[PDB]
Design a binder for these strands. Structure first.
Lengths: 150, 98, 109, 206, 96, 127
RNA sequence: CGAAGAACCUUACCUGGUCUUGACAUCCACGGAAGUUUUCAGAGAUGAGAAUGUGCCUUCGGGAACCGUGAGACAGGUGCUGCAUGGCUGUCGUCAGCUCGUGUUGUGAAAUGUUGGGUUAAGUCCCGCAACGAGCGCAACCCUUAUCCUUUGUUGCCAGCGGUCCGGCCGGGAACUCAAAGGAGACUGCCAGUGAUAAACUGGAGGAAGGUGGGGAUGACGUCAAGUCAUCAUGGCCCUUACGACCAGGGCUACACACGUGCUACAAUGGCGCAUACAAAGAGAAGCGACCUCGCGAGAGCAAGCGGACCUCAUAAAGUGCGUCGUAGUCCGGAUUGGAGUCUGCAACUCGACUCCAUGAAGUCGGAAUCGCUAGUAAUCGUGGAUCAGAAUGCCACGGUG
RNA sequence: AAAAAUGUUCA
């Protein structure tokens, strides 16, 4: 526009010490409310803990920062001729976007509870059952093979 | 003892010209109470400003009706002469008790 | 002029006090001598026809006598003295300065 | 248009109300109505007078009536001979005690109802409209003003091609709500329909 | 206006508490929900006359029911009119 | 009592008398998790307390009223460090720049005429 | 949407009963205190009666109020022209625009200014200039909210002090929160850099709050023969044993379709059973109505308290911990209908609201298409108020969570 | 710098 517009910073999850975990409650926000959201977060977190005595946090991180978005098509003027310009994506916004997606992917896997979903779902890191693998085959398919420029 | 209820619209009225009875009462009575507030019993309306349709414009009203009541309390019952017959005030609910 | 002194020309905020200070300091930058008058002089020596050409028209429509000198590319007109010369030199401009000061209150002495 | 009542703004800063007297929800309605009844007869029989404000204090629910005139003629050379008669009407309508207090405006013709009613009366005798208003606008500035702005309706002659008489004059702000501006409304009447009369006079500051 | 529509409305209020209200309200136990006794009952259903449930509150300067305010005893516009002009103590525009 | 604090945040104002004594949080004869059910809220207001480490060495009573659930805890968080800018004036800077004597001004806004909420307006269609 | 409540009544519409200086106004004359309680018939309007009251003053005639009758000048009409109109309102547009006087330029229409170079949220401010000055507007000036000070302390308060029926329950103290009158503060004001050294901008600090802080309220000169004769006001026009008036019933809640604006679900991130957590703001003497008794229940009885920082309305709901059910049209969801009741009203058949039980729907998250919303906003959960005899999935307002 | 008409009479 003419100003970069954001808003206030949300607080890191205070009983596991982690901002990512708190931004994923927000993703699951139900009735407008964080409360009934945090339950299920924590329920499925434990599911993952049982199968994974080590960090079960690096099966979110790997999966989604393998996926590196880059494509859209715009246009701008250059030397008095406009040209249809392809535009790259900046590495920060790649991150920001990617964290959301996996957790968005739940409530459609046709289970009973968000337990059985987010548990079985999140555990994978590169063999995903979540939207992360399913966007790979479109992002790199497109790019630099049907994209004439950076 | 006595309840003295001053209840009037404006602050320029519940606070102003109301000191003249606190004054005279000191001598006749034996104490005064300063002007104690109260949670203010207030209104606000809405009237449709149009004469026909256009509910996008309605005149939205407010109206504080202030309440500092003062409320002089007296076991002294000689206060009454200089209190009430002598002094006078209008625009303000003037109420007395025993 | 006399308001300047008083603290009520520099009262409240800087969005007033120095707004009034600026609006006056830049309103006797060159128009300080013109407020000393109330009317119209008997004479008006200009040097220009490049920025005082409004004078050589309008105050020869009032018929106030203009004496003048060239810009070296225009001949001032409407006028009633004009001189061959330049608008820069110390044998021109600076030299003519001292016939202001010694001939004008020195005309009836 | 989208408009705001002009003296409806400066209530409590310097502008009073006309029903100032405390009361309750039962009689709020009643006493309000009760005043206005008596006002109607008043203004019409005191249209031999240029009137200037009317306000009520109910000091003991026994009224007061502080009608304003700008002529002192109401109370000189008919000193109570007049006023009685008015007080009598007061008594007739208002069945609580009836008393009358008369105030004066030394301003003769300028500001508030005074340029209101004055300019109406002129239209209603069919005094030259063009020139009329022009004289009433030099007048108020003689007696001094910081600028006055009347506005009246057009459609003169019943038809409209654009000839509405406008008037602004002087300077008349409305940004500063502490530089205090007078306003009254009044309406002329013609045998081809009503014409508006609205007077906005800029005398004042607190 | 409509003078005629108004005129009607007025007279209902006289009878409303002069031949009804404490004439009619005379029901007691034996004619309400406490108890029942058909004698009294059917002979105090017998007069109907005037009734305040057949009376609207009305504006006292229009007599329309639309946009009514008890609080001032008048209608929509017959509040706003007065109120804009600054006649009435302490009513003000919302501004909090 | 020897240090007082206000702190009025999210419509709840909370008295604070920090008393001499020992680390404990006594608030309306209870604790947090005892004056409320399950909470996220309880952890959040202990955040200034671990920030330089306190509450092992003084005792405090709190009497919060009104407003929220989070709003109450808003008030608690606010008043403790408006009584620990006056216990320590060295952490005066470290509490204002750590946004704990900063008043939250995101407060619930009023409804208007012709609007459903504070900004919400009707939908329109025709199909 | 006008309409914050269409039984009758209202309500203009309709069908019927009924009247014509009148239902409503003034003035003149006549008769009669006004009235009071009552009869019959009628749907009622009314019509025709039976008894009873003999007031207020008198200057005794006369009046004063009022009732009936008589008679016109007149009266009545939410009837028609919103292109005869005022007033109001919406509209673009809360857009930064819009002009004017003087001078000047051009035969003039017009131009200038108001354009340019920077800058502002802003025709905002600066630099420059045949433009110089001024006026309207924009924000300012009005409000409100974010701290802290001042005061005042009862119906409000409880630190610190004791008492305690352990309950701020008692005294007591005004500290405190609160209340609500009067202040303190912010001014790109300071600090650095940047910028025509110009205006000014970007960071920095300090603070509750910086660079139009956050939220209101303010619509310019004007345009739309915009809407509104039915809110009201009104020019003309028209109706005149009536487009007038008064009353009873019915309609405005059809229906064979189409569309706008809403509400409710489709479920476990939920539903149900248990117990439980914390709110804010209003309401109120033909008023709110506790309590206690009965009623499964709606509610009825009985009856206190309050002119409401006292008492009543009053009981927040999501939330929370536990019990369970398992993704089924079901334990989801609730339409439909049957039968029985409560209440407001004289009275609820068309066309009033509430409860008990029974019956238990459609709907398995919605196509082409389409809409709002930038932060405490969206989202979601309740709550109160008006209107109102009696009709909220409506309007208006309030906080919780978010 | 991504195709595209048409507007009954009358202030």
């Amino acid at each position: 526009r003419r100003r970069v517009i954001g808003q206030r910073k949300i607080l890191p999850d205070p009983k596991f010490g982690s901002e990512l975990l708190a931004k994923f409650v927000n993703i699951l926000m139900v009735d407008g409310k964080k409360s009934t959201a945090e339950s299920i977060v924590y329920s499925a977190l434990e599911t993952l803990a049982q199968r994974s005595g080590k960090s079960e946090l690096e099966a979110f991180e790997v999966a989604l920062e393998n996926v590196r978005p880059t494509v859209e098509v715009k246009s701008r003027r250059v030397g008095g001729s406009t040209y249809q310009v392809p535009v790259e994506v900046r590495p920060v916004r790649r991150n920001a976007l990617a964290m959301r997606w996996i957790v968005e992917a739940a409530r459609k896997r046709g289970d009973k509870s968000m337990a059985l979903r987010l548990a079985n779902e999140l555990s994978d890191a590169a063999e995903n059952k979540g939207t992360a693998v399913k966007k790979r085959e479109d992002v790199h398919r497109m790019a630099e093979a049907n994209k004439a420029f950076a | 003892r006595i309840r003295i209820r001053l209840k009037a619209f404006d602050h320029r009225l519940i606070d102003q010209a109301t000191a003249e009875i606190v004054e005279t009462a000191k001598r006749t009575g034996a104490q005064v109470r300063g002007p104690i507030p109260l949670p203010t019993r207030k209104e606000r309306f809405t009237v449709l400003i149009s004469p026909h349709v256009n509910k996008d414009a309605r005149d939205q009203y407010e109206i504080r009706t202030h309440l500092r009541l003062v409320d002089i309390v007296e076991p002294t019952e000689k206060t009454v002469d200089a209190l009430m017959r002598l002094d006078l005030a209008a625009g303000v609910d003037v109420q007395i008790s025993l | 002029e006399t308001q300047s002194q008083d603290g009520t020309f520099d009262k409240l905020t800087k969005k007033e006090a120095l707004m009034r200070t600026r609006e006056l300091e830049k309103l006797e930058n060159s128009l300080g001598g013109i407020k000393d008058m109330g009317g119209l002089p008997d004479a008006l020596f200009v040097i220009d026809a490049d920025h005082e050409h409004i004078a050589i028209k309008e105050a020869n429509n009032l018929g106030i006598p203009v004496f003048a000198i060239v810009d070296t590319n225009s001949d001032p007109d409407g006028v009633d003295f004009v001189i061959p010369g330049n608008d820069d030199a110390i044998r021109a401009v600076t030299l003519y300065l001292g016939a202001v000061a010694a001939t004008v209150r020195e005309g009836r002495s | 248009g989208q408009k705001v009542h002009p003296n409806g703004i400066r209530l409590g800063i310097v502008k009073p109300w006309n029903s100032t007297w405390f009361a309750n929800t039962k009689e709020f309605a009643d006493n309000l109505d009760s005043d206005f009844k008596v006002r109607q007869y008043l203004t019409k029989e005191l249209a031999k007078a240029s009137v200037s404000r009317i306000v009520i204090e109910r000091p003991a629910k026994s009224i007061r009536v502080t009608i304003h005139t700008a002529r002192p003629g109401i109370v000189i050379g008919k000193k109570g001979e007049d006023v009685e008669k008015l007080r009598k009407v007061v008594a007739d309508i208002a069945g609580v005690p009836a008393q009358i207090n008369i105030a004066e405006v030394r301003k003769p013709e300028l500001d508030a109802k005074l340029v209101a009613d004055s300019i109406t009366s002129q239209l209603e005798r069919r005094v030259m409209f063009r020139r009329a208003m022009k004289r009433a606008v030099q007048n108020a500035m003689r007696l001094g003003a910081k600028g006055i702005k009347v506005e009246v309706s057009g459609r003169l002659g019943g038809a409209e091609i654009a000839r509405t008489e406008w008037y602004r004059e002087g300077r008349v702000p409305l940004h500063t709500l502490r530089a205090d501006i007078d306003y009254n409304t009044s309406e002329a009447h013609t045998t081809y329909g009503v014409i508006g009369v609205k007077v906005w006079i800029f005398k004042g500051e607190i | 206006a409509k003078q005629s529509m108004k005129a009607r409305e007025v007279k209902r209020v006289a009878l409303a508490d002069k031949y009804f209200a404490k004439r009619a309200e005379l029901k007691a136990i034996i004619s309400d929900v406490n108890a029942r006794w058909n004698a009294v009952l059917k002979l105090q259903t017998l007069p109907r006359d005037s009734s305040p449930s057949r009376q609207r509150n009305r504006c006292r300067q229009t007599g329309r029911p639309h946009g009514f305010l008890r609080k001032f005893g008048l209608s929509r516009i017959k509040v706003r009119e007065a109120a804009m002009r600054g006649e009435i103590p302490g009513l003000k525009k919302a501004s909090w | 009592n020897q240090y007082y604090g206000t702190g009025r945040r999210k419509s709840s104002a909370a008295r604070v008398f920090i008393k001499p004594g020992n680390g404990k949080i006594v608030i309306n004869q209870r604790s947090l998790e005892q004056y409320f059910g399950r909470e996220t809220a309880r952890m959040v207001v202990r955040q200034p307390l671990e920030l330089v480490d306190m509450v092992e060495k003084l005792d405090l009573y709190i009497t919060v009223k009104g407003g929220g659930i989070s709003g109450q805890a808003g008030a608690i968080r606010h008043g403790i460090t408006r009584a620990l800018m006056e216990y320590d004036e060295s952490l005066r800077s470290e509490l204002r720049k750590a946004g704990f004597v900063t008043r939250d001004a995101r407060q619930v806004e009023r409804k208007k005429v012709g609007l459903r909420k504070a900004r919400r307006r009707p939908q329109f269609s025709k199909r």
